[PDB]
Amino acid sequence: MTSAVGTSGTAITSRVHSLNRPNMVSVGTIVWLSSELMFFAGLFAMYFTARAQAGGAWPPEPTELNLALAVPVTLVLIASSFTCQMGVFAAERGDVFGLRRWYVITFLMGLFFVLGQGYEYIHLVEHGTTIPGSAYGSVFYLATGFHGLHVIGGLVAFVLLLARTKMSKFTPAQATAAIVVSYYWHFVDIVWIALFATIYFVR
Amino acid sequence: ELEARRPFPERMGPKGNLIYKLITTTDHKLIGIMYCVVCFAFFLVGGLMALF
Amino acid sequence: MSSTQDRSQLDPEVERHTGVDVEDVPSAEWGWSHMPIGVMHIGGLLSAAFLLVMMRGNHVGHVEDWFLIGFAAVIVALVGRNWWLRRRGWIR
Amino acid sequence: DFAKLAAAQGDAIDSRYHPSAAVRRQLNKVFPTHWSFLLGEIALYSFIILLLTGVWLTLFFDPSMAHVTYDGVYQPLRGVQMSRAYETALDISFEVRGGLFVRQVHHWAALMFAASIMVHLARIFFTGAFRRPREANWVIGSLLLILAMFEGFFGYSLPDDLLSGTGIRAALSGITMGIPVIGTWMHWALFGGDFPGEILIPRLYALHILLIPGIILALIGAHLALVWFQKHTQFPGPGRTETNVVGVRVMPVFAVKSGAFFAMITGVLGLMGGLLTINPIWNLGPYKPSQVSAGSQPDFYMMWTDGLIRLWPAWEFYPFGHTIPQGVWVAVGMGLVFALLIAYPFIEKKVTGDDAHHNLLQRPRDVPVRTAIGSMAIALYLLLTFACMNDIIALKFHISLNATTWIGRIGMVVLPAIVYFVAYRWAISLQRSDREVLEHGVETGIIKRLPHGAYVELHQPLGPVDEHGHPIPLEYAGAPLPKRMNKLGSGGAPGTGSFLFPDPAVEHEALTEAAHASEHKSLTALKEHQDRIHG
Amino acid sequence: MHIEARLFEILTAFFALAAVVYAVLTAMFATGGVEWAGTTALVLTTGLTLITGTFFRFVARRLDTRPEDYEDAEISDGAGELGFFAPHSWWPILISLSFSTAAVGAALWLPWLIAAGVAFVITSVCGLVFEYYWGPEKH
Amino acid sequence: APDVAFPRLNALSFWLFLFGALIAIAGFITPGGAADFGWTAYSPLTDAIHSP
Amino acid sequence: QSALLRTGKQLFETSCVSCHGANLQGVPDRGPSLIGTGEAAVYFQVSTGRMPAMRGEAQAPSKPPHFDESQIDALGAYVQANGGGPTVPRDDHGAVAQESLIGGDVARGGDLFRLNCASCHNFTGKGGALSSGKYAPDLGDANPAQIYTAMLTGPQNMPKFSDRQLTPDEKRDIVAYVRESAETPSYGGYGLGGFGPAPEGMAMWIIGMVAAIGVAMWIGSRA
Amino acid sequence: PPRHNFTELPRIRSERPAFELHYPHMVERMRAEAHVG
Amino acid sequence: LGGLSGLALLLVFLFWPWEYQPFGSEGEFLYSLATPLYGLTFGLSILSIGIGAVL
Ligand SMILES: CC(C)=CCC/C(C)=C\CC/C(C)=C/CC/C(C)=C/CC/C(C)=C/CC/C(C)=C/CC/C(C)=C/CC/C(C)=C/CC/C(C)=C\CC1=C(C)C(=O)c2ccccc2C1=O
Ligand SMILES: CCCCCCCCCCCCCCCC(=O)O[C@H](COC(=O)CCCCCCC[C@@H](C)CCCCCCCCC)COP(=O)(O)O[C@H]1[C@H](O)[C@H](O)[C@H](O)[C@@H](O)[C@@H]1O
Ligand SMILES: CCCCCCCCCCCCCCCC(=O)O[C@H](COC(=O)CCCCCCC[C@@H](C)CCCCCCCCC)COP(=O)(O)O[C@H]1[C@H](O)[C@H](O)[C@H](O)[C@@H](O)[C@@H]1O
Ligand SMILES: CCCCCCCC/C=C\CCCCCCCC(=O)OC[C@H](COP(=O)(O)OCCN)OC(=O)CCCCCCCCCCCCCCC
């Protein structure tokens, strides 16, 4: 125990030196996100089959999408992605507290998006459309609510990473953790853009 | 000019050396062995169904 | 580095010279570490006997009796294997 | 002038009496700061909450089987014949402000009391806090646990209810009346005659508000006095020996943290009394022998006795013109369970041979046979507890009721053995892990050696390092070892500014340097005290 | 990472071709027009491989030729400090058990066992992630 | 290589396999039994109406 | 009605003749004969969905109905005409009565429920376990007509409560109690299911005890 | 295998590093006949 | 927070629609969470006091 057998100032460090080598955590996160893309592909297939088998009026008469509440939430999610990227820049720097600020506002805006989605869910359920109520209702709820579960998972990842940064000193390991969490958030917002363009505009 | 080896390698090992590894295993080699044993157990379980 | 080594003198009092050894149980001196093998053999045999005896009961069922038979059989097989191996010096 | 008033009151106290020396001894008494030593405090605090809520409940409860039509406020039970006990329990629930909350927090406090007694028993048994000294403390603690079990049994049976009255009819009546030589005589003397005798609930009320709680209070006083004057044992550590107590003094730190823990425990109990529904007696209609539900379970502490009743395989003996019902089997089983629990320390000392005065606990891994036996016993207890719940387990988790019953029957001899073997081997493997850490240092990230492609985990030794790379192995000292550089001085100094914004560099450097100096001072003090004791 | 990126680029080319041809030959020459399930699955597996290949290509252009990618690379060239590979840990089994308790809660429609399995999963994932960051206890 | 990229993750993968596999086998202990529908588990036969 | 009978026959012939043989006689060892079961039995069973049954097991589980109210009525009319038996209640208009089956007295309904229903179901209509793979299901999904018809025709391992045994007024009171107990909010917090001891003990051990142990670990020092 | 799979690594030149390691003489041969097929 | 929650307990206990409400009645929702509010306020108050003391 003279000084240390492992000449490192962090019990946990980057899994490989990322300057010359790929970041293993980033590579794994990217691959897993590419798989989650196929999960959402299955959901999209369900939705598109229902759309094709609909008899012309794809959103049934009882259902009526609320763009007034669907445009603000997607705009807020895009803003959350931008703030998450700013936090990523902070993490690339040594700016622990800048990363914390950016990720906190990102978490707040993601929570606002989740609450807006829940409000639209409540309004839609009140106005007839329901999972058991109709095929459109069910496919729409499956797609958008599985995305909402993914957003909740991203929120959990955000708070968990923030706790990690609180409890241990900022290092390339935590910077990479923030980077991969941001990759997940960007994937979530991209699939939300796809779902918005499909559900609301394309219909 | 000669090596002092055991007459035979250790057969099994001391009591209580594997059980905690399995729970805390992080060596891919041990995990791969756990896969092979567990997967083969399901082969016997699944294979017994075919006999019925 | 921010850790201090520990010095411990616990009062000892069987003297562990017979039974289990540190090579088999590293903390043999620190606490009760040896259960006589006869105890476990007899316990397994009595557990198998109890499982078999539960067949006698007020149940018209038969898969229950067969499950009891199977579990008692595997218990007896384990006890017999252990006893035989220790008799021969842990061979085969 | 609060300071003047305090000084004058201290002078008055020390003039009227002379408690200076005794009070100083109490304040200077050192208590180890291990978390597992607060498990008994949980039970003590839950007991205090139980007393406080029980007084309030007694102010409103009327024990009697005197039949009455409700004519209260709860509409779904109106004009239905019920006992005064049930009627006043309903009155507490509905027609008394906060009465539902008080009774719910009372029942939740009872459940936490039982659970914390069980956890404290596990702690002491597995750490060996009973051998040579404190063995009588363990004995009276076992009596205390039994008394708590039966106290809760009489408590949730106190409001004459369908569920609890069915539980009484099963256990108190059938088991008591099945006992061979004096079973019916005990039944008639407890119930003042047949089962629905008009004195059962008043007798249980006496037993539950005064008699059994009085004995529990006396035994808790004896328990705490024994812990106080037979200084609390401690885990092996740097400066901890069999002839000292390393920890914190009563006055500044221990007292404040114990009071805060009491506050937090009562907060948890109140939160659960509010947010979680316990014993909805209004849903559970008044007791009638002809009515019953499908659940029919006792509280989780008597659930193991009920599970024993369910699982035991209907073995009845019929001597010459007599019957020996299956109730005697479970009665003898409970007797054996309690006898073994009470007499374990003496059984353990007779078996092993250790009567040495033990003040240093032993980690459960360091005693494979005892931790194995405790794991086996906990497995049997869990098996019985879930056997009692097999009805709801079968209902919700789709498993046939016969299958659950026979799973319990077979497991209660198979599962204890499996858990014994697994726990024994697990303890020995924890010892092996400790030894490997001692002889090789903590594990870290892998490094590829320069000349060749060797991979080495780049360990970190915990002791003096030999001239070459490998360290001098240390000797196990009965204390936990750090298996992660995480928990050592490695990557543990985040910017001390705030969650959102930093602080000035001068302040951060001052704070971190002061903290590092304090850690050095503490470690050096422990090291020097250890050297002085062992040299 | 040229070959690593080019593998996914080839997969992207093939999957894009498959998606396009399937979409065309299902819009025309199918009983009910575009299938809308195979088409979407092919499009988004093209997206899977496209994302992976694009990231790999970005990294290949960002990083100089690694010893691993370099033929005639000596072992000493790559010899050095490999990063942190997690040693023994018992959090994975707890995560698996928590997710299994959520899964059985979903199968047997028990909202209470779903709610608890999810709590369980959050706790165990927090434990796994914080395993090597929980600073020394400060007393 | 010395180990897999995420050696705690591959440990989770094995345990997810083991416990995920067990709860599928668990259909047998239920009174109804395991899944009637074949391995393919075609849609109409799998809905709550069929194989409930 | 002629067309109602014809529709019931057409649904029967392509739904259940494989296990309730044509002519309504039961297929030996696949299904019982439906002669005498009546319209109430058909309504309850098919509406709860148990009858499009795709396995012979300990108990036929509930499931989404395979027929809409009109087809349920068609099948019930067909079975009633073939066999003749109990009929589902109906309101003034003609639809299956739902609110009319809510008996006025709830204390009487609860007493009757405890004497007869709680025996196996629960204190408040949650489920209960039975001998070999069977179970009394939760009543919170059943609507008043379903509860009334369940009593009227003992579906499976359930005693058959005739009108003579439980006058329709008593059955209406029991229905009122069932619906009231199902729709009534838990006073005092979250009723953990409806079973007291077991859900309460689990919630103690998981919520209160983990909180206490975690707080103790926070306050104290590992060693 | 030792924990971490290796105390050494041979010169990696082809798809058979261990064959080259154990039979150095074949190294030239494995290249000479490779293209003949 | 402990003090504010204690004051909340006091105010809720003194002024809240307690008392049983028969069924499906206006005020049944308030009654259903009357007792939960008592427990929430009380437990939160004393728990926050304990957390402050521990800190
Ligand atoms: C609707 C309705 C009726 C609602 C109310 C519900 C009801 C009926 C009752 C509950 C209501 C109440 C009154 C709740 C609060 C209960 C209560 C007294 C909580 C106190 C906790 C609190 C407020 C702490 C504030 C924070 C703070 C500054 C703490 C430091 C100062 C304090 C309070 C120190 C208290 C120390 C303490 C717990 C003394 C307990 C005395 C007893 C019985 C034993 C002492 C003792 C202890 C505590 C050991 O641990 C121990 C361990 C080993 C050997 C011996 C001992 C020993 O003798
Ligand atoms: C605490 C739990 C751990 C227990 C540990 C002990 C392990 C040993 C388990 C022993 C299993 C015994 C199973 C046999 C039991 C038996 O004899 O009953 C039978 C039913 O067979 C079965 O399914 C057998 C199922 C066996 C699966 C056991 C699964 C073990 C699980 C529980 C382990 C997970 C534990 C989770 C731990 C949680 C930890 C909590 C912290 C028949 O009933 P029945 O249904 O009436 O069948 C009639 C026909 O017979 C008749 O022809 C026909 O006519 C019909 O009438 C038909 O009904
Ligand atoms: C940590 C402290 C916090 C404690 C939790 C406190 C939660 C407070 C909730 C809000 C205030 C009280 C609401 C009372 C209103 C209310 O009661 O809540 C039911 C919901 O009920 C459910 O389903 C459960 C839904 C899932 C969410 C709650 C799960 C919490 C569990 C996990 C807590 C215990 C811990 C156990 C750990 C388990 C793991 C063990 C290893 C909702 O109605 P419903 O759903 O329709 O009930 C059906 C009648 O209708 C119908 O007739 C009747 O027949 C029934 O079917 C009935 O369910
Ligand atoms: C690897 C083994 C592989 C064994 C695999 C066999 C699986 C086949 C089982 C059931 C198939 C469905 C039939 C279902 C009906 C049953 C057949 C029958 O009728 O067989 C005649 C009598 C009962 O007559 P009963 O009329 O049912 O009436 C009775 C009262 N009234 O039983 C007998 O003698 C013959 C015994 C019949 C089954 C007993 C099987 C139980 C468990 C075996 C061992 C468990 C081992 C555990 C190890 C730890």
Ligand code: HEM
């Ligand atoms: C010593 C440990 C004690 C335990 C484990 C315990 C347990 C219980 C339990 C579980 C109940 C059922 C509450 C309900 O169903 O709502 C109960 C009821 C009751 N307890 Fe205790 N109790 C204890 C001490 C006391 C004390 C000291 C008193 C009096 C000061 C008391 C007075 C009462 C009363 C009057 C009832 C009836 C309340 C009702 O019917 O709702 N208890 N007890």
